[PDB]
């Protein structure tokens, strides 16, 4: 199958709970109906003002009978959610009443459903800004204990077995979120990209931390080189369970003859399927170069490192983009 | 007609003067022979100790007949070159006699031939470090008046006229030399890359200065975004004669449907053939991704911005590689 087909079938198998806070938006509700029709989720929670949602559904001819509308103003969890948000945020000086008002927002309320164990996967961003989506994620859901940084990746399908990797499948990370990762964040990015490789490609991760330098060739003074080198040291210190090396140029990562000249006895030779970029320009430009100048497909961006999975959509997304993002996030949980 | 054959043919038509300071190296003399045999240059100057050069030739069985040995020890330009070097370098405290000894070095002498008008193109690096070759370039030859920075590009051939560019050809720059260009340096790289587009691809240059941000989308705080935006302002101030725009994501540069959304009314829409990367990691990773994960070929790195063309070879280059480098550098004059 294709990647999208495989992710949808795996979501059907996983039978997890989806929450959608942009439930007054037509595309979101159409996606929710397709999710129900395809059995992509065990439960579909629509979060928002009940009569605004029902009104949108009425006008778009959408049956909600297998969906659960949760209204943050009326929910039985309202008081507990306001209290949990206050405890989370009181260190920034907000009041309990400000917390209660903030938790009437569908985006915050859906994120708190994940934090509190009432749903498994959240998708938003067809109508909210990326900044708002990531902020709800960072401040309500938080990160896994193994990282301090939330990041993102793309799944790159070169549609060419022979191009190395895992039958031409790669994880590229972080090509969308963190502008200039510190050495510690870069190590976090590598750890989360390793998890993404296991979830999305289904093979063991072999990770190359990339640079214009290979194992010293660029010198010892450029902070950008040292940042990547320090990340590699940090990964050794952390005793991670995946194979990794850096700093490596792309050709040293992917062409064994070159690895043998520039990085001898490197443990990644001939096996790399996960590329960690040194900064956001290199990764954002890089994945687009592969997408737009070759027959490769790029899937994502997929968020990683969050304690519970969420996705941020483009504001111009299609219904099927929403469905695809929901399936991937459900498979991540 | 391939790219290497196109350049070889064009050098034959151009009938320029080549200087080779590594004339005691066997591959260089074998290349020199092919260059004479193929009429790729009007004149082939071998620079060095005539006896060491003749000795190498005899040991290897190489005929030198239509080549001209120019011996820095006895050349009629001996005293003028020493004075010129002294004037260039006296601000570092050297004496005239030291300048004269310095100008017995074949590499320095070849570069001075370019500066003084006695040859058109220099190739070295088969047995000199890149740093040595570049330093000779910068201290002796200098840069064109339109820039203060020498840099490099690659000619990328996607082998697919629909991918954009000029029949599938692109200039990528600077993917090999400057680790973190200042805004002034990025503007210089754009100017030099536009020159290389004209020389190597043969079409009008349309230059995209790349970033993870498109026309403000990544905000106004990240210094790497501002460096690119500043370089664009600088190009406007210089009133350059090529079309440019930035900061642009790669898809906004290359995909007009996306340009119309993220960069409406951009001057580059649908015409970009020259990509300027914001730093060396993004460019070095970027060109290699295209080379290694697609059908594209990568030719270079080609130096650019020097007042007279020179080329740095790889230490392990083939004889045919040397010939191809000479032809490109001659086409560059």
Numbering used by the authors:
A (entry chain A), B (entry chain B): 1 to 333
Article, verbatim:
As a part of the hypothesis, we have proposed that T. pallidum contains an acetogenic energy-conservation pathway that catabolizes D-lactate, yielding acetate, reducing equivalents for the generation and maintenance of chemiosmotic potential, and ATP. To continue the validation of this pathway, thus creating a more comprehensive view of T. pallidum metabolism, we have characterized the protein TP0094 (UniProt Acc. #O83132), the putative phosphotransactetylase (Pta; EC 2.3.1.8) catalyzing the penultimate step in the acetogenic pathway, i.e., displacing the CoA moiety of acetyl-CoA with a phosphate, yielding acetyl phosphate. In the current study, we focused on another enzyme ostensibly involved in treponemal acetogenesis, phosphotransacetylase (Pta). This enzyme is putatively identified as TP0094 and, in this study, we determined a high-resolution (1.95 Å) X-ray crystal structure of the protein, finding that its fold comports with other known Pta enzymes.
The structure is divided into two domains, called “Domain I” and “Domain II” according to established nomenclature for Pta enzymes. Between the two domains is a cleft that is implicated in catalysis by other Ptas. The two monomers are intimately associated, burying 2,640 Å2 of surface area, and estimates of the energetics of this dimer using PISA indicate a strong likelihood that the dimer is stable in solution (i.e. ΔGint = −22.6 kcal/mol). Moreover, the C and D monomers adopt an “intermediate” conformation in which Domain II is rotated only by about 5–7° relative to the open form. It is this intermediate conformation that most resembles the conformation displayed by both monomers of TP0094. Thus, the conformations of Pta may be important for the enzyme’s catalytic cycle, and the intermediate conformation of TP0094 comports with its lack of substrates or products in its putative active site.
